[model samples]
Target: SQAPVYGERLEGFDYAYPVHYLDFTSQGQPLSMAYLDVAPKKANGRTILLMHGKNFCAGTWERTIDVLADAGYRVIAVDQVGFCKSSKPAHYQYSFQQLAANTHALLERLGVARASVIGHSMGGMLATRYALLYPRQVERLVLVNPIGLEDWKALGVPWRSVDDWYRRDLQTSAEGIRQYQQATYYAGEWRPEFDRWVQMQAGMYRGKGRESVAWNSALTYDMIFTQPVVYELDRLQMPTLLLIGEKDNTAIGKDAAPAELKARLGNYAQLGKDAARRIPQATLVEFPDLGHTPQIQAPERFHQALLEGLQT
Candidate 1:
C-alpha cells in the first residue's frame, strides 16, 4: 500500500479516448497528461478549465466542450494524473490541494493566467480547492453532480485500506459500473452512452498500466474519504453554480456504510440547495429526474442549463 510494487513505467496501449498528452512532473516522476484544447476561433477572452471526476476523464466532456467552445469560450479539458491518457506514476500523493497544485502547474505551463472552471464529481471537489487557493486566476466556478455534499467518514462509512481498495480496483467490471450507475447515476435507467465510460474504465484494468492506475485510484480514494471540502463552501470568492441531479446516491463509500447511515446520505437534491444557500454567491440548478452523470445522461438539457448559468 505504501510502496511501489512494480518497476519503471510500463507502456500501455494507445488510449482509445481523444486527448492531448502533456508532460509534467510531480516529485520528479514524469506525469503524462491528455487534454483537449479548443480555443474560440473568434479570439474571445474567456477560457474554461474543465476538470473530470473520479470515474471519468476529459473525453466524457466531449459534448460540453463542443458547446462551450462554440459559444466563444476556450475550453481546456484535462485528464488528471492517473486517469485516462495521463501517466499513472508508481507512487504518488493524492489530495485535493496537491491535485489542485498539479492542475495549477499545468495551466501555467499552458499560459493560462485566468479561466472559468467547470468540475464534476471529484473534479468538483478539486475545483473548489483550486478556486480557494487561486481566487485571482478563477473567474467563475461550476459544480455538477459533485460528491462530498456530506462527509461520509463523519457519517459512518467504513474506511478501506489502500491495499483493500487496490484489490477491489483490480476486480472492477463493466457490470459493476452499470450496476453502480443504475442505482446512483441513472436512477434505475441505463443507456448506451453510459457504456463508453464503463469500457473506458475497464480498459485501464486490462492495460499494462493496470497496477499503477489501480494504486493511484486507491490512493485517491483515501484523499476523497479523508478530506471533506463541504465545510469550506462558504469560503469561495467566485460566482458559483451548482447543477445537481436529484437521484444521486454516491456517498463516498456508501456501499460500505452501515445500513442506517447509507440511507441517511446522498440526497444531493437537498444537498445542492443547502450548499447554494450556504455558499456566498451560489445558484442552485436541480434536475429532478436525472441521476449522477447528468451531462452524459441528458447532454442537451444539461448543457442548456450549464450555458445559461455560465452566461449569467
Candidate 2:
C-alpha cells in the first residue's frame, strides 16, 4: 500500500523564510527533513538550534527566527520527521533518541560544531535527548515549558496503544485544537494571533496526508509516553535554563487519567523547581501568569528572558 501524501512542503504555511530540505535515510528508508537555516546579516559566531513543540511547525517559529537573526545569531529551526514538511514514513519507529540523532546529522551537515539548543514542549524532550547523546556538541541547553518534567506512567495515568491514539488523532480538528490549547497552552485565554497555529495543525488533518500525519502522531505519542527523561535530569552536563509558565498544566495522557491522578500532573511551577534541583548547573525562570507556551503568548517578554539566559 502506497503511503498517502500530506503536502509535505507545507503549502498553506506562510513561513518567514524559505524552507530547505536535507535528504537522508533512516530505518532503511529514504527520507527528507525540512528546515529553515537562516544566517544573520552580520554573523555573531554563534548558532542556536530551535526545536518546535509537537503542535508547532518550523514556520510557527517565525517571530523567534527573526529575533535571533536580527541579533546576529544563526537560527536553524526544524520540522522533525512526521510533524510538518518532513517526510512521514508509513512504517517507522518514532523515538526521541532517533529524532535527536537525525537532528544531529543535520547539524553536522550544516557545519554547526556547537550550538545552544532551545526547545519547547515535546521539542524540549528531544533537545534534552540530543544534549545527553552529544554533550560535546551542545554549548548550552534551554527548555521552554518542556513536557516530561514528570513521568506520566509513574503518576498512575493509564497507557493507550497506538491504535487508540490513531483513532483520537483522526478526530483532531481546528475547533478541537483551539479548545485544547485554550485549556492547556493559554490558560483559557484566546487571542487572534494564536489562530494561525491552530490552522496549521488542523489543516493537516483536513488535507490529503491526514492518515499519514495522524498515524505518525500516534506513534510519537506512544514514544513520548513510554520514554520518560525525568529520571535522568541529573545526567545533563551543560549549563541549563528552565523557562516555565506557572499556569501551565500540560501532562501527556492526562485526559485519560482519573481525577485524582490528573490533578497531580502538569504542574510546571513545581516541575520547574524540581527539574532545577535535579540538574547540575541549572537556572530557573518562571512567568507567573503564563501557560504552556510563554513564547507565543508573550514574545517580547519571552525573548528578552531567552536572550538573557543564552548569554549567561
Candidate 3:
C-alpha cells in the first residue's frame, strides 16, 4: 500500500531517456516544458511528436517511442505545462488551444518544421487541436482512444466546478486511479506493469506539493470538460488514423448522468466510426478486444497497425 512519493514534478520517477527543458513565458507566467526527443542514428528525416493523456506524462510514452526508434522515425514526447516535470502554476488559464500553441512553439524552438503527431487519451484531444491550428505543419495525425469523441456536456453529462474537481483530485490515491483505469482504460484488467504506472501517478499526489498538483489538474479537467473538439473534427486537413479500442467507454463526468444517458456515453465503437466518416482523409483501425489504451493493452498489435497505417 506504500507508493513512492515523487516530488511535485515527478523528480523520483525516471523517464526512459534523457529529459530536456524548454523555458517559455506564457500567460504572464514563466514555465518550463519537459520533453523526451528520441532519435535513431540512421534517421528517416520524419519526426513523430507524441502528446500524452491528461493523467500521463512523457515518461509514459517510452514503449511507443522505442517502437518509433526502431521504425527509424525520430520521436518527441512532451509534458505540457501544468503536467509532469513541467511548471505547474497555481493560477493560469488552461485551454486546449493554449496547450496546442505551446506545442507548436516547442517544435519551432527545436527547429522541427513538420511532424507526424500521435496523441493518446487526453493527449489525443490536444493533438487534434495542434493539427487543426497548424494544419500545414502536421504531416499526419493519429488519435488513440481520444476522449471528447462526443460532447458529454451537450449529451447531458452534468458539470463539476473547478473547486469540486480540486477536492476530488486532492483525495487521489493509487487504488482509485487503478480501479478507474481498470474499468475505463483496460476493460476490467490488471497487470503488474499497470501497478508501476499507478505508483508513478499516485506518487505525485502523495507528495508535499499535492495541492499544487491538484489545483493544476482541476484547471485542466475544466478545460477538457468545457472544450468540444468534436465539432471541428471535420476541419482536420491531414491524413488521419483513428486507433480505437471499441471496448473503451471513457466518458468524462459520466457518473452524474442518468442510467439511460450514461449507457449511451463514451461509446468508441460508434464514435470512432462517426469520426472516420467526418474526416476527409481518414482511416479507421478498430481493436475490438482492447479498451481505451490499446497501445498499452496490446502494444505489439497496436504498433503493427500504426506502422502499417503510417507507411501504406
Candidate 4:
C-alpha cells in the first residue's frame, strides 16, 4: 500500500494567513521555502520576523501575529526548510548558519533593510545567528525561552547520532507529543487549544511524507546539539531581550544523560540571568509561573511585556 503524498500543508493544520513561498536551489536541490508576510491595518514602519521552535510551526504563532499586526507592526512568520509548510528536502544540510542565510535571502528578496527579529525555542538560536551574521540589519533581537543557553555536550550530555535521532523521530505520535509538551512546555497544564499544535506536529509523522519529516528532524536535532551559540553571546552589538519562562527545563539531549547529570540540565531560571549578564545590551523579563511557551500559556501577559520590550 502506497502512502498518499502530503503537500506542504499537512492534514488538520492551517496557517493563520495565506502561505507564501520562495523558490530556490540549495545544496543542488530545488526547494520552496514557505512564509507569511502579514501587513498591519496601520503600518508602524517596523517589521518583526517570527521564528518557530523545533516542535512548533508558523501556525502556532496565530495569536502573536494577530496581536502584533493589530498593534500596527508588520509581522513576517516563517516556516524554515524541513519544518511546517516548507519543503522537506530529503538530502539537505541543516545548520544554524544555513538557516540564517536562507532567512537573510528571504528578507533580501522582500527588500527589507532592517527589522526587529524575534525567535522562540530553537528559533531563538537561529535569531542569534542571524543578528550575528548581519548585525546592522537587525534593529533589535528578542529570545523567548530559547534553548542552547548552555552547551549540552560540555555539560555531560551523551551525543546521539543522526541515525539514532531519525529512529526516535519515526516513533513520534500525538499522545507522546502531548505528554512531552504537557510536562516541558505548559508546566503540567493542558488546554484545549494546545491540542492543535500537537496535532500539527504529530500529523506529519503519520503522513506519507513521514520519512522526509523524520529525516529532517534528525538532521536538525544533530545541528542543535552540535552548535553552541551561548559562547558568542557577548559578541552581539544590538539591543537584546531575553523573555524567559522560569519553569522551562528544555535541555536538548537530556533524555540520554545519566540521572545525576540530567538534574543539572535545563535550568532556565539560572541560564536566563547568566545570559543577560553576558550580553552587553540585554534586558531580562521573567515569567516565573510560565513554562517553555509563555506566549501561548499566557498571551495577554506575555505580549504586554513583549510590546513594552519592543518599544524600549
Please report the candidate that would top lDDT against the real structure. 3
Write down the RMSD of all candidates, one decimal each: 4.4, 3.2, 1.1, 2.4
Worst 10 residues of 4 by lDDT: 1-10
lDDT of 4 at 298: 92
Off by over 4 Å in 2: 1-9
Q: Using lDDT as the measure, what is the rank order of every candidate, best first?
A: 3, 4, 2, 1
Name the weakest run of 10 consecutive residues (lDDT summed) in model 2. 1-10
lDDT of each: 0.82, 0.90, 0.91, 0.90
Residue 15 lDDT, candidate 1, scale 0-100: 32
Q: Encode model 3's per-residue lDDT on 18-97: one tens digit a residue.
A: 99999999989889999999878789779999999988889888899999888899899999999999998868989999
lDDT tens digits by residue: candidate 1, 1-312:
111122213233233334576787788787777788877777567899999999887877888888888889988998887776677778887788878888888889889999999999999988999999999999899999887778888877888898999998888777787788778878888877577677677666665667777898899888888888989999999899999989887787777777888788888878898899888999899999989889887889999999899984
Model 1 residue 45 lDDT score: 75
Question: Lowest summed-lDDT stretch of 10 residues in model 3?
Answer: 1-10
**Residue 59 Cα positional deviation in candidate 4, in Å, after optimal superposition:** 1.3
Best by TM-score: 3
Clash pairs, candidate 2, are 6-209
Write one digit per residue (lDDT tens) for candidate 4, span 1-312: 122233434644668798889998999998888898999999988999999999898878989999999999999998898898888897988889999999999999987999999999999999999999999999999999998899999988999999999999999888888889998998999998888788778778877788888999999999999988999999998999999999999998888889999899999999999999999999999999999999999999999999999994
Off by over 4 Å in 3: none
